[PDB]
């Protein structure tokens, strides 16, 4: 594999030397011939994703040098129109499509009134390449190359620009849908390779987050709905867990607060092998950071975090075929610390979590016990006032579900923290037996 790449890089170097040579002598059609030559190296199927990525990055280096060179050399000149019709006649589809994206972007910058139509075409032309790997990189280049000519709201007031933020969304979202199709087809043994290319698909989400026109409104109405639709119908646990964690990370915490329901609603329908635990915990933590943030707008009081999460988590757990009990307690643990540093005066919340955990346990190892001691240590650490712990009625029923030595160590920990008071003392003491 590395010999094959070594011979590819070596052809790339010699062709880009002549391309950059014919550019200096202002021999642009010769330049584009050598570009079409080096682009022929991307047609191979004998390179792993890691090797192909090295060959791709060696190539897009020179194409981007050809892009800015055609842009500078012409200002707003009409000649790019000759080059854009020229490259349309290239022999092989891969070299033709890379050059159409490259020249098309230069074409838009000296014909701003043709922007919307060029962008539309470029994304449809990419549909012609169906190979998963080559299609992934080709459409990856499509994002980067058109990165700075997508219609956005922070645009200058100049006339002559065609397209608006609506068109950019459809552009990226359509590319996202097509890139995701290609990604699931790669599965047909190191799946370690598919994991590497998850970022190619993830770039569509990044590019959306960096469009200034994507506000909380268009995000809730158009963007997230488009993304989740592709994620839920994906039917692949690798892609689903990545894309959902990519949504949490990429978009701001101000967007998630207005889309907590449809997001957690999509967490239920995810494939059974997805770790919906880690997803939900991630979203909860990002909102804990956003709640305890200085100089920022906290969680508005009309957004009941504990309500939205306790219900939706109950629905997420309910839909999991074989979710480990250990993980079932983790969600409660994140549900119980959410209910005490976002709503400290809410003692009713904490007992509801514990009660809910009791229910789950009635219908049912060391792993889960390490998580239950976590769950019961949180109230006593937060409530250094056992008078408050007296109120939690389901604190002690959950004691009943421990490992025998774990029962005494938790009970020892509650006593180290020190009618109802003396009647809970005789109960813990009995279990020490």
Q: What is the DSSP string of 344-387?
A: TT-HHHHHHHHHHHHHHHHT--HHHHHHHHHHHHHHHHH---HH
Q: Alpha helices of 114-235 — where are they, by DSSP H?
A: 115-125, 132-145, 165-185, 192-209, 216-218, 224-232
Distance CA 348, CA 327 (A): 23
Task: Name the resolution in angstroms.
Answer: 3.1
Distance CA 249, CA 226 (A): 17
Q: Please tell me whether residue 18 adopts helix, strand or coil conformation.
A: helix
Q: Determination technique for this PDB entry? A: X-ray
The torsion angles phi and psi of 2, rounded to 5 degrees, stand at -75, -30
Which own/partner pairs from 229-236 qualify as long-range (CB within 8 Å, at least 24 positions apart)?
A: 230/176, 230/177, 230/180, 231/266, 231/270, 232/266, 232/269, 232/270, 234/180, 234/184, 234/271, 235/184, 235/271, 236/184, 236/187, 236/271
Domain count, the chain: 1
Q: What is the dihedral of CA 96, 102, 103, 109, to 10 degrees?
A: 160
Residue 201 structural domain: 1-433
- Cβ proximity of 110 and 74 under 8 Å: yes
Distance CA 204, CA 334 (A): 30
- Cβ proximity of 60 and 141 under 8 Å: yes
From 103, 101, 113, 112, select the one nearest 82 (Cα to Cα): 103
């Amino acid at each position: 594999g590395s010999k094959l790449l070594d011979e590819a890089i070596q052809a790339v170097k010699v062709q880009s030397f002549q391309m950059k040579r014919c550019l200096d002598k202002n021999k642009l059609m010769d330049a584009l011939k050598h570009a079409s030559n080096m682009l022929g190296e991307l047609r191979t199927s004998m390179l792993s994703p890691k090797s192909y990525y090295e060959l791709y990055m060696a190539i897009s280096d020179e194409l981007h040098y050809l892009e800015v060179y055609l842009t500078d050399e012409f200002a707003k000149g009409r000649k790019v129109a000759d080059l854009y019709e020229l490259v349309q006649y290239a022999g092989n589809i891969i070299p033709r499509l890379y050059l159409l994206i490259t020249v098309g972007v230069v074409y838009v910058k000296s014909f701003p009134q043709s922007r919307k139509d060029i962008l539309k075409d470029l994304v449809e032309m990419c549909r012609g390449v169906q190979h998963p790997l080559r299609g992934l990189f080709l459409r990856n280049y499509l994002l980067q190359c058109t990165r700075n000519i997508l219609p956005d709201e922070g645009e200058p007031t100049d006339e002559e620009t065609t397209g608006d933020i609506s068109d950019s969304m459809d552009f990226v979202l359509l590319n996202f849908a097509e890139m995701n199709k290609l990604w699931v087809r790669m599965q047909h043994k190191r799946e370690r390779e598919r994991q590497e290319l998850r970022i190619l698909v993830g770039t569509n989400l990044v590019r959306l987050s960096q469009l200034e026109g994507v506000n909380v409104e268009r995000y809730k109405q158009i963007v997230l709905t488009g993304i989740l639709e592709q994620v839920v119908n994906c039917r692949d646990a690798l892609a689903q867990e990545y894309l959902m964690e990519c949504i949490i990370q990429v978009f701001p915490d101000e967007f998630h607060l207005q889309t907590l329901n449809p997001f957690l609603r999509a967490c239920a329908e995810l494939h059974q092998n997805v770790n919906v635990k880690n997803i939900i915990i991630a979203l909860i933590d990002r909102l804990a950071l956003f709640a305890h943030r200085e100089d920022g707008p906290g969680i508005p009081a009309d957004i009941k975090l504990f309500d939205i999460f306790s219900q939706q988590v109950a629905t997420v757990i309910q839909s999991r075929q074989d979710m480990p009990s250990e993980d079932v307690v983790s969600l409660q643990v994140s549900l119980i610390n959410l209910a005490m540093k976002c709503y400290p005066d809410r003692v009713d919340y904490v007992d509801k979590v514990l009660e809910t955990t009791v229910e789950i346990f009635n219908k049912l190892s060391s792993a889960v016990s390490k998580e239950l001691t976590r769950l019961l240590k949180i109230p006593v650490d937060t409530y250094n006032n056992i008078l408050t712990v007296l109120k939690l009625k389901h604190f002690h029923p959950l004691f009943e579900y421990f490992d025998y030595e774990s029962r005494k160590s938790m009970s020892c920990y509650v006593l180290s923290n020190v009618d109802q008071v003396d009647s809970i003392m005789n109960l813990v003491s009995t279990l020490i037996q």
